[PDB]
Design a protein around this ligand. Structure first.
Ligand code: ZN
Ligand code: ZN
Length: 66
């Protein structure tokens, strides 16, 4: 409850109203997730079974020159 580890994206199913499209398959998030699993670290919407297919590449930010 103090050390911050690092694993795959922190996908988290949110709730807006309609399901968003998937970024791994490009298919609406229907019959797969209540709404959509948005990564609470880099902002990445995916399905509930497409995460096991993602190579886990979280930590993609901008302004990395310095
Ligand atoms: Zn991410
Ligand atoms: Zn998907």
């Amino acid at each position: 409850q103090t050390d911050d580890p690092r694993n795959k994206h922190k996908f988290r199913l949110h709730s807006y109203s309609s399901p968003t499209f998937c970024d791994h398959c490009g298919s609406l998030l229907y019959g797969l997730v209540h709404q959509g699993m948005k990564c609470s670290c880099c902002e990445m919407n995916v399905h509930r079974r497409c995460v096991r297919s993602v190579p886990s590449l979280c930590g993609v930010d901008h302004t990395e020159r310095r």
